[PDB]
Amino acid sequence: IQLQYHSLLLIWLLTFNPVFANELVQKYLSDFLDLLKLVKITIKEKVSRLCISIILQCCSTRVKQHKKVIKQLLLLGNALPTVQSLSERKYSDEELRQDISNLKEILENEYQELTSFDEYVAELDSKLLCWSPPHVDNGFWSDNIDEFKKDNYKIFRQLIELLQAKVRNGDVNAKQEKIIIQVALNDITHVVELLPESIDVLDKTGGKADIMELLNHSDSRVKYEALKATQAIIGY
Amino acid sequence: QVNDELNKMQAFIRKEAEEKAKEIQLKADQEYEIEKTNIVRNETNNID
């Protein structure tokens, strides 16, 4: 606990400077997300207050691209729900409460201009998926279907590349890997059933062949997803 | 399980699609003569 408190104090001191905080945030985005998660994970009031202060310093307007950094954090690291939960939570430090309120306000401001298509794009860029509600609610997959085929079907090409990478990495058959593969297959099936003009693009890129080959996966969910994709291809 | 039935149905659907494609090719072949006549007639008018 003492070591964690000292590390948090050092991080806060380093982030006190705006240039130093801006440099650290870009080079340690994963570390920043881990610290944000640990802020809610940790139960110590002092550690939570230090983590909130460190997050606020990185998100402070004095840092370069402060709005962009805050938006990237709220998108990739799911900072907005964590800040909302922290606001609903209770802390023994008034400074910690004020920092939590400021972080919640910043997250709300960032998410005010956010969109479901933006969340899907961020998830695709992160090359990770866990059956997000945009991939489940038909509203997003219907409104953003036209945008998927934009830029020579750039989104469809990225999804096909992600599916091919998952197929290459599917030999591990990890639970997280299986979930990601299933989510990618569902997204591909949706983007094929809606606006079927991308079927030829997927066939040319080899996505159809990869989907057909994925039917050999031992996972029952993967098998069902492959069967659904095959039915959407030529089946009924 | 039921996956065997789905694979058989999927194979049948793919086989059925081949017959439909052949009909499309047959329909196009018939239209080729009509298109050739129109092209020849248009060229004949220009030549005349």
Place this chain on the structure above:
Amino acid sequence: AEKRTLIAVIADEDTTTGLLLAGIGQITPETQEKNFFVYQEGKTTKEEITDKFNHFTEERDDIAILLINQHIAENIRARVDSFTNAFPAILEIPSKDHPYDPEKDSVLKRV
């Protein structure tokens, strides 16, 4: 205008009853008439419907919005088209066993 604060319905019996429950109109103590001029499409007459619509859309009527069911407004479609004045506005409310069709909307036809 200030006197325009009133809503008129000329729809079917069920729609008229529902809107009266909502409380659209009032019975004029002096004129002994109410804005809830309930009139079945099959009952009364086309001439009577046209006369009621003309009275509600003219003669310095206080109705702001004229509510006519699509079924009843279809029979008086000529008068509905003729009513090109900006106010009072007219709407084609759907009726039971008579859904509203975009082709039957006189005002939307101006697009």
Place this chain on the structure above:
Amino acid sequence: TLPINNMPVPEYLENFQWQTRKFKLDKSIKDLITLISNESSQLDADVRATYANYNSAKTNLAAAERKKTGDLSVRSLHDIVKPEDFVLNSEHLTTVLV
């Protein structure tokens, strides 16, 4: 519209990760339950209304088909009543065509 066979509802069941739209994270449990129930009930009511409107439109189409079928009770009034028997071009005369 996406086909029902491709609906990811079981895939969502595999995760069940709550979204912000269906319920605010910081909202109260009672408030979140009320909001979700109200939204889902409104969606169900809209679906029921759309189904009723489609049924009414189908009934109207069936009535039109019956009218076009030639049954004189619903067929064109031109063939139902003879032009000679029906009173025409007379201001003091009219036809019944029952």
